[PDB]
Amino acid sequence: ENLYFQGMAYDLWYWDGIPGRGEFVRLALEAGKIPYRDRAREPGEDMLDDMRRRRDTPPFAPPYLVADGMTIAQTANILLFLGVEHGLAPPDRAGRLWVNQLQLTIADLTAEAHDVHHPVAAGLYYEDQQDVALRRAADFRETRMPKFMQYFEQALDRPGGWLTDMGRWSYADLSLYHVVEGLLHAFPRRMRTLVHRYPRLMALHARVAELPELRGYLASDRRLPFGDGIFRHYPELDGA
Amino acid sequence: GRENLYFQGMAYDLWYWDGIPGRGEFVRLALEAGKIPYRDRAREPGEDMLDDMRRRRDTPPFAPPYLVADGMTIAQTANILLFLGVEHGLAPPDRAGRLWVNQLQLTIADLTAEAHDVHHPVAAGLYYEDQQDVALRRAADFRETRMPKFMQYFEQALDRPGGWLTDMGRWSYADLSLYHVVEGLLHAFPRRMRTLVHRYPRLMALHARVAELPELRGYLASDRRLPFGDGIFRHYPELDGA
Ligand SMILES: [Cl-]
Ligand SMILES: [Cl-]
Ligand SMILES: [Cl-]
Ligand SMILES: [Cl-]
Ligand SMILES: [Cl-]
Ligand SMILES: [Cl-]
Contact assignment for A120 to B123 by CB distance below 8 Å: no
Query: CB count, 10 Å around CB of A4?
Result: 6
Run of H or E including A191: helix A188-194
> Residue B48 C-alpha to ligand 3 middle, in angstroms?
21
- In sequence order, the β-bridge partners of residue B13 are B39, B68
DSSP 8-class letter at A9: P
Shortest Cα–Cα distance, A87 to chain B (Å):
16
B232 touches B131 (CB < 8 A): no
CA distances from A70 to A10, A177, A205, B91, B192 (A): 10, 28, 32, 17, 35
Contact assignment for A155 to B121 by CB distance below 8 Å: no
Q: Give SS3 for A229.
A: coil
Find the closest chain A residue to B158 by CA distance.
A56
**Nearest CB neighbour to B103, from listed A73, A139, A143:** A73
Query: CB count, 10 Å around CB of A236?
Result: 10
Backbone angles phi, psi at B41, to 5 degrees: -60, -40
A119 alpha carbon, closest ligand: 2
Shortest Cα–Cα distance, A140 to chain B (Å):
8
DSSP 8-class letter at A1: -
> Residue B3 C-alpha to ligand 4 middle, in angstroms?
32
Contact assignment for B106 to A74 by CB distance below 8 Å: yes
Domains observed in chain A: 1-90+211-240 (3.40.30.10), 91-210 (1.20.1050.10)
A132 close to B (CB below 8 A): yes
All residues with CB under 5 Å from ion ligand 5: B 131, 133-134
Closest CA to B65 of B31, B17, B109: B17
User: Which chain B residues contact residue A150 at CB under 8 A?
Assistant: none
User: Which chain A residues contact residue B167 at CB under 8 A?
Assistant: 56
A203 touches A159 (CB < 8 A): no
Q: What was the resolution (in A) of this experimentally determined structure? A: 1.8
Q: How far apart are CA B234 and CA A49, in angstroms?
A: 38
Gaps in chain A with C–N over 2.5 Å, residue before each: none
**Nearest CB neighbour to B99, from listed A70, A101, A115:** A70
Contact assignment for B145 to A70 by CB distance below 8 Å: no
Q: How far apart are CA A154 and CA A91, in angstroms?
A: 23
A57 close to B (CB below 8 A): yes
Q: How far apart are CA A73 and CA A61, in angstroms?
A: 7
Contact assignment for A123 to B141 by CB distance below 8 Å: yes
Q: How far apart are CA A150 and CA B60, in angstroms?
A: 12
Using only C-alpha atoms, chain B has a radius of gyration, in whole angstroms, of 18
Q: How far apart are CA A129 and CA A121, in angstroms?
A: 8
Q: Give SS3 for A159.
A: coil
- What's CA A176's distance to the chain center, in Å? 8
Contacts of residue B36, defined as CB under 8 A and 6 or more positions apart, other chains included, come to: B12, B30, B84, B88
A234 touches A189 (CB < 8 A): no
Q: How far apart are CA A44 and CA A49, in angstroms?
A: 12
Shortest Cα–Cα distance, A165 to chain B (Å):
11
Contact assignment for B82 to A97 by CB distance below 8 Å: yes
Counting one residue from A and one from B, how many pairs have CB atoms under 8 Å apart?
A: 104
Contact assignment for A97 to B117 by CB distance below 8 Å: no
A194 touches A149 (CB < 8 A): yes
Contacts of residue A231, defined as CB under 8 A and 6 or more positions apart, other chains included, come to: A19, A113, A114, A181, A182, A183, A185, A186
Q: How far apart are CA A94 and CA B79, in angstroms?
A: 11
Instruction: Find the farthest-apart pair of alpha carbons in chain A and give their distance in angstroms, rounded.
Output: 54
